[PDB]
Design a protein around this ligand. Structure first.
Ligand SMILES: CC(C)(C)c1cc(NC(=O)Nc2ccc(Cl)c(COc3cccnc3)c2)[nH]n1
Length: 351
């Protein structure tokens, strides 16, 4: 039944893991946990193991922990990250305090690819294709990523691509401040809090990512929130009256109307030399009104992806029950909910 655990300290943190996992080596940490690379001897895999940092600190924390576990137990798709394993050294609910998550070891992110390599149009096709493929899956489970950027995309030597979230820290006001990649890929409505937002926020990010794969340059490297809004409105144009009504923040609405009105730019004169089909796709992604952005599913059928598109191999997620998001529970209740999910986990099969 239960495997044997051994202990070791790595960077003032104690790790207790099953013997199967060997050669633990620290790779990163933050307020929400620490990660080691390791070798899983039962599967033959290089794996990553995250140890959650006091997962049941507060109500809000415990619920956060439950949420990621549920989330990761559910993601089963080639272009999305999955759970290899999840474990606890705890022998009963009474002593459950620590949670460990196991995933495939990710090496290079997409930020490393565009930085250190020249990409062909065909490269960009395959890379964006896979993001959209994964995103169709994620969205069909009513999950929004909200933080799509190159660094949250893992890419191996064959340009095969997985969406995940490496994030280990709080998403605070300070990290979104200033000249920071954290904010360059954010949909404007979620950056200036215009309104209740939706799936299409992630599509805007793909817009920004695709542009950067084509040029090798950040699309909207704002020096701050407002500077970035100007860079954005310079390209796609200031909003019309139709879009202004949909902006719930009267204060935000009011700021936008103080701007000099500008037309949408010619994208062929921005993305000089790009495939006309890439240009067209960007025009349908980088749309200010989120009601009117192309969806992941719609985007898969666009002629830019003709080499790769296969409507029989672009699967959707099983129904995902997200009713817990509405419930207010106590720490011990989130905790036990989490514990059930730990003990019920069934590992994936390798072929
Ligand atoms: C929207 C999607 C489904 C993409 C999403 C994913 C997440 N969160 C995570 O992916 N979390 C997570 C948890 C544990 C581990 Cl081990 C990892 C991968 O971490 C590494 C670190 C270093 C090298 N390789 C993998 C991710 N939220 N939303």
């Amino acid at each position: 039944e239960r495997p044997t655990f051994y202990r070791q300290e790595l960077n003032k943190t104690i790790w207790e893991v099953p013997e199967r996992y060997q050669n633990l080596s620290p790779v990163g940490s933050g307020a929400y946990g620490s990660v080691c690379a390791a070798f899983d001897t039962k599967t033959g895999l290089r794996v990553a193991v995250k140890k959650l940092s006091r997962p049941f600190q507060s109500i809000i924390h415990a619920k956060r922990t439950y949420r990621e576990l549920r989330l990761l137990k559910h993601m089963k798709h080639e272009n999305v990250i999955g759970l290899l394993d999840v474990f606890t050294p705890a022998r009963s609910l009474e002593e459950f305090n620590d949670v460990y998550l196991v995933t495939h070891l990710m090496g290079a992110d997409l930020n490393n690819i565009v930085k250190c390599q020249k990409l062909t149009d065909d490269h960009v096709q395959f890379l964006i294709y896979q993001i959209l493929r994964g995103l169709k899956y994620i969205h069909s489970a009513d999950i929004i990523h909200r933080d799509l950027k190159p660094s949250n995309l893992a890419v191996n030597e064959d340009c095969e691509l997985k969406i995940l979230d490496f994030g280990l820290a709080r998403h605070t006001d300070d990290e979104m401040t200033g000249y920071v990649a954290t904010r360059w890929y954010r949909a404007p409505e979620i950056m200036l809090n215009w309104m209740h937002y939706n799936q299409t926020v992630d599509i805007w990010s793909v817009g920004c990512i695709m542009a950067e794969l084509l040029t090798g340059r950040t699309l909207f490297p704002g020096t701050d929130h407002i500077d970035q809004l100007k860079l954005i409105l310079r390209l796609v144009g200031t909003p019309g009256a139709e879009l202004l009504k949909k902006i719930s923040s009267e204060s935000a609405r009011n700021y936008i109307q103080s701007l000099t009105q500008m037309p949408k730019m010619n994208f062929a004169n921005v993305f000089i030399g790009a495939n006309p089909l890439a240009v067209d796709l960007l025009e349908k992604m980088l749309v200010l009104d989120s009601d009117k952005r192309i969806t992941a599913a719609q985007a898969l059928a666009h002629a830019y992806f003709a080499q790769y598109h296969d409507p029989d191999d672009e699967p959707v997620a099983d129904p995902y029950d997200q009713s817990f998001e509405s419930r207010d529970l106590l720490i011990d209740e989130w905790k036990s909910l989490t514990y059930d999910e730990v003990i019920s986990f069934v590992p994936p099969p390798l072929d």
